Design a protein around this ligand. Sequence first.
Ligand code: CLA
Ligand code: CLA
Ligand SMILES: CCCCCC(=O)OC\C(C=C=C1C(C)(C)C[C@H](OC(C)=O)C[C@@]1(C)O)=C/C=C/C(C)=C/C=C/C=C(C)/C=C/C=C(\C)C(=O)C[C@@]12O[C@]1(C)C[C@@H](O)CC2(C)C
Ligand SMILES: CC(=O)O[C@H]1CC(C)(C)C(=C=C/C(C)=C/C=C/C(C)=C/C=C/C=C(C)/C=C/C=C(\C)C(=O)C[C@@]23O[C@]2(C)C[C@@H](O)CC3(C)C)[C@](C)(O)C1
Ligand SMILES: CC1=C(C#C/C(C)=C/C=C/C(C)=C/C=C/C=C(C)/C=C/C=C(C)/C=C/[C@@]23O[C@]2(C)C[C@@H](O)CC3(C)C)C(C)(C)C[C@H](O)C1
Ligand SMILES: CC1=C(C#C/C(C)=C/C=C/C(C)=C/C=C/C=C(C)/C=C/C=C(C)/C=C/[C@@]23O[C@]2(C)C[C@@H](O)CC3(C)C)C(C)(C)C[C@H](O)C1
Lengths: 168, 188, 171, 87
Amino acid sequence: KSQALPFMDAPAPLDGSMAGDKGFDPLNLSGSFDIKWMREAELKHGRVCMLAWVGYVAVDNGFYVPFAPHVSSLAAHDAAVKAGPMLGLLLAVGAIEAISYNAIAEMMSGETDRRPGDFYLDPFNLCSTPEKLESMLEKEISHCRLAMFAFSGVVTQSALTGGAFPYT
Amino acid sequence: RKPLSEYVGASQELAAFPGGGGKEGAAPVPWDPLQLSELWKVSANNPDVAWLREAELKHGRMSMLAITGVMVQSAGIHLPGNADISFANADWAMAPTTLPPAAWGQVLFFIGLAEGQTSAGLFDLWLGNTEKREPGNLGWGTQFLSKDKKAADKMRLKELKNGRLAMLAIMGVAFNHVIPGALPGCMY
Amino acid sequence: KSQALPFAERPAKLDGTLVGDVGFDPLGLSNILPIEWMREAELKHGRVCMLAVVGYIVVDKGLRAPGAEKLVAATSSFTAHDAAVQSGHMWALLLACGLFEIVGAGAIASTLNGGDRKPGEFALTGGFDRDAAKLERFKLAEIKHSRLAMMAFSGLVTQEVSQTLPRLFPA
Amino acid sequence: EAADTWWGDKDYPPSIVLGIGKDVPSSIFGVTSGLAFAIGVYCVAQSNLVNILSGSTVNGFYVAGALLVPYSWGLHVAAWIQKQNGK
Ligand code: CLA
Ligand code: CLA
Ligand SMILES: CCCCCC(=O)OC\C(C=C=C1C(C)(C)C[C@H](OC(C)=O)C[C@@]1(C)O)=C/C=C/C(C)=C/C=C/C=C(C)/C=C/C=C(\C)C(=O)C[C@@]12O[C@]1(C)C[C@@H](O)CC2(C)C
Ligand SMILES: CC(=O)O[C@H]1CC(C)(C)C(=C=C/C(C)=C/C=C/C(C)=C/C=C/C=C(C)/C=C/C=C(\C)C(=O)C[C@@]23O[C@]2(C)C[C@@H](O)CC3(C)C)[C@](C)(O)C1
Ligand SMILES: CC1=C(C#C/C(C)=C/C=C/C(C)=C/C=C/C=C(C)/C=C/C=C(C)/C=C/[C@@]23O[C@]2(C)C[C@@H](O)CC3(C)C)C(C)(C)C[C@H](O)C1
Ligand SMILES: CC1=C(C#C/C(C)=C/C=C/C(C)=C/C=C/C=C(C)/C=C/C=C(C)/C=C/[C@@]23O[C@]2(C)C[C@@H](O)CC3(C)C)C(C)(C)C[C@H](O)C1
């Protein structure tokens, strides 16, 4: 009954209802550990990869903010660590991830019905009807899976070559 | 429990005197002067005769293998030597020293894996609760021996005797490399 | 009772559920691990050796990949491995083989022991599925060619290293 | 409160003694035990095959990999627990 691997059936019954389900889990990690943590990690990785690909492209083009010495995105990490504001960005991320500590701890063990990677940062009601919510969830998770490979390729090509915008 | 009388391993040459004999086993009870197989009756700390049989079978098998290795390494017959590895130390007890960690570390590793994975039911021994295990019955050569009772017991008695001799011998080649003279005709 | 050894019993667990079972197990090695793992190992080894034989006898007679350049790999398949390790292409091949091995091998060996499918299907039929007589005939042909090319690749490599390959595609 | 974790009347502990890894099958536990043991022994061997120096040769990856040796003990114990439990 598996979809991606048609010689199997359902790598544990954990893969039955969530968005982006294609029965693809050959190493049975969906049934070995609770799948809510896996979906939280997947969505979180994909969102990080999306913003990381957007930032890596924009810094490599010329969008540079005030001050911020104009260097390529490969050396921008070291340049801004020696500059200083990378530590402040790390502090802000750490505060958000302390709130994420609270969110994930409430989500896994009862007493909160939060979806993995949910939050409630939905100002414009683009997921009011359940069908719209399902469609946006499918688009979000597909964008996650695409942007992981996209940013991985961008970083690898930028590191091995000298560096350009299309990365050869 | 199994009270040591049905265990094959009694020897004719400890009944060599007029009175007592057979194919190769003594008739009136196997040899146990210190009554070490009766030590389970007082306290459960002492092992059962099943654990003792498993221990001596393991010791005998390792000792046959060890004395054969001693007899072959001591003069010639070494594996072909390539790059970064020479099997040239003909002197026993020092051969693992002149050996790379990929070789001496691989013998111990596979010995440990085979020992741990064949250790299913050794602690169902020490208490006489055989059911499974059946002392040394690892499966390597089960159904290969004869399906009757006399021939199988004869084969097992052959295994135990050769094994005991090998134990005494590998401990005669040892304790002679340690202190000079524990075996008059030594050759090693 | 056996067929390949018609003088010494018949090996246990070799009843004939798998194809090409003539009862050739003189050492009785069908008891250490389950027979599904052994059949999977035999089939995987045979597929690897058939692809290896084809690749060796095609590269050795002379054929280069798209933009395969000019290195000691292009001289012969003898030094092709040591050439491509240094160029790092063997790391890419190991990555691709590792990805497919994770997915295929983990799924395929995890579920036979649980119980779920024939030993070595992969469901990539590529055509012939309806003619089950041809399916079992192709299973027999696959395992026979598997054993034949395991022997063939062993012979090829040992012949070539025994003379250090003086440019002999018959070897 | 907590869970009934006592197993003095059984020959093996229940699966709930593993906490967050109470559903991992025994084969994954054993394979990861062997892998963690091999990697950890390699990492600690990189401290005696090569003399660890005052700052020059410390190699924190080998330090983090050195924690896999006590982790490999817990994985092969959990492999036995899941095997007796049938998982
Ligand atoms: C056992 C199989 C096997 C192995 C180990 C090799 C190994 C090698 N071959 Mg080779 N080859 C094979 C089979 C094999 N071949 C077969 C069957 C053919 C068809 C006739 C060829 C045709 C061939 C040519 C024409 C050339 C080589 C070359 C090479 C060398 C470098 C290859 C390279 O850069 O790849 C690393 C780079 C990669 C991109 C990896 C390849 C990824 C493919 C897709 C394999 C991945 C798995 C694949 C999908 C199979 C899974 C099947 C599964 C779905 C059931 C290397 C020594 C080249 C060379 O230098 O020789 C002088 C060369 O010119 N081979
Ligand atoms: C690893 C050693 C070992 C062990 C565990 C056994 C175990 C056994 N033997 Mg056995 N045996 C051994 C070595 C061993 N044997 C050797 C080397 C010989 C040749 C001399 C024999 C000759 C022999 C005969 C002829 C018979 C047995 C029998 C038995 C069984 C009952 C006797 C008993 O309880 O012994 C328990 C033994 C031990 C607990 C071993 C420990 C030894 C002591 C306590 C410590 C070491 C002292 C020792 C003197 C060491 C000094 C140096 C030494 C190398 C000489 C039992 C299964 C009988 C049998 O088959 O019953 C069915 C029987 O008739 N054995
Ligand atoms: C890829 C490898 C393949 C082989 C290995 C392997 O997989 O076997 C696995 C196996 C058996 C098995 C198998 C099954 C699982 C049963 C079934 C498998 O089949 C399947 C898939 O079902 C087959 C098989 C045979 O494999 C058994 C595994 C046994 C294992 C893994 C035993 C570890 C002890 C660790 C100890 C004692 C640690 C001491 C640690 C110490 C003393 C320290 O920590 C000291 C310390 O200083 C350190 C070092 C660092 C410091 O920071 C901390 C301090 C200072 C304290
Ligand atoms: C110096 C030396 O000696 O070594 C050299 C050797 C050598 C070999 C020359 C070198 C090289 C090159 C290497 C290693 C190249 C590796 C390249 C690699 C491995 C590149 C991955 C791409 C991933 C893709 C395309 C993913 C697509 C994903 C696609 C197309 C999807 O649709 C994903 C999907 O999710 C969506 C979007 C929606 C989902 O609903 C459905 C799915 C899941 C299907 C190096 C680096 O120079 C090193
Ligand atoms: C590593 C290595 C090698 C090796 C090796 C290995 C693994 C060697 C192993 C050797 C091994 C395992 C040797 C066991 C001996 C046990 C004995 C002798 C037991 C005696 C026990 C006796 C004599 C007990 C007798 C009694 O109990 C009886 C029977 C009844 C009781 O009432 C009365 C008493 C107590 C008296 C090579 C191959 C050698 C060289 C190579 O290069 C490197
Ligand atoms: C399943 C599938 C497909 C498929 C497939 C595949 C890949 C089928 C492949 C079959 C394959 C590739 C089978 C090879 C056998 C090799 C043999 C028998 C080697 C013999 C070699 C022998 C007998 C001897 C060799 C010698 O070297 C020796 C011993 C000494 C030398 O001196 C002399 C020579 C050199 C002669 C489709 C249909 C393509 C697509 C579909 O979607 C999915």
